[PDB]
Amino acid sequence: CIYYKDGEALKYX
């Protein structure tokens, strides 16, 4: 699953 956490941004699921 998603779980971004970088690039002055983030995301998950």
Side-chain angles (χ1 to χ4, degrees):
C1 103
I2 293 66
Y3 175 24
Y4 234 85
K5 61 116 102 279
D6 219 53
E8 230 281 80
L10 79 308
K11 193 147 185 162
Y12 178 107

